[PDB]
Write a protein that binds this DNA or RNA. Structure first.
Length: 155
DNA sequence: GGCACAGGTTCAGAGCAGGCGTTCCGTTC
DNA sequence: GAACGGAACGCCTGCTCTGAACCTGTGCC
């Protein structure tokens, strides 16, 4: 997760300032293919939720817990990337929504799994891999954007 | 009918202040 | 003029300040 975060940040900064050489021209299509594969991997390629029950006792439910956190982190980074790429093109935003829908699906799976045991699993609130910067820019673009050219995506 | 957060409570430790213990001078017969 | 009560500097007791955690009670799902 953190790795991908590092990658995203360095790479965006590269495109931003460095250019004004095959690794990054590859990585574009790398993350693209990863994103598309991520959209339509539905938790049974990961073997989650029904094959396992996130048992903090069992080695396997422990593993599930950990894998799931990693997954959600991954998704978050990809959300940042998909947003960053476009000049507000709609297919990527649909992708972001679907990513988030799987993410939230995982979070509420854990709420089902964290509803039963006592509330000392405060590891669910594991900090997001979104920069302060991106979040500022996101709310800026949600609430104070009336620009029709972008607005079809923001709606 | 159960879980989570709050709030109370309690204990452990540590730190510090004051009163009594020793020693002397004032006051009242 | 003397004696017994008021008076000052140091150490120990205990009490308080504070934090941290447990646990239990209530309200909402």
């Amino acid at each position: 997760d953190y790795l991908l975060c590092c990658i995203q940040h360095c790479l965006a900064w590269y495109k931003n300032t460095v250019i004004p050489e095959a690794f990054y021209e590859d990585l574009d299509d790398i993350l693209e293919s990863i994103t598309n594969r991520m959209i339509k991997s539905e938790l049974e390629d990961f073997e989650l939720d029904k094959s396992a029950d996130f048992s903090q006792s069992t080695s396997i439910g422990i593993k599930n817990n950990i894998s799931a956190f990693l997954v959600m982190g991954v998704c978050e980074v990809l959300i940042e990337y998909n947003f960053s790429i476009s000049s507000f093109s709609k297919n990527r935003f649909e992708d972001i929504l679907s990513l988030f829908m799987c993410y939230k699906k995982l979070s509420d799976i854990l709420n089902e799994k964290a509803g039963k045991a006592k509330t000392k699993m405060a590891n669910k609130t594991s900090d997001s891999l979104l920069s302060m910067k991106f979040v500022s820019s996101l709310l800026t673009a949600l609430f104070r954007d009336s620009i029709q050219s972008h607005q079809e995506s923001l709606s």
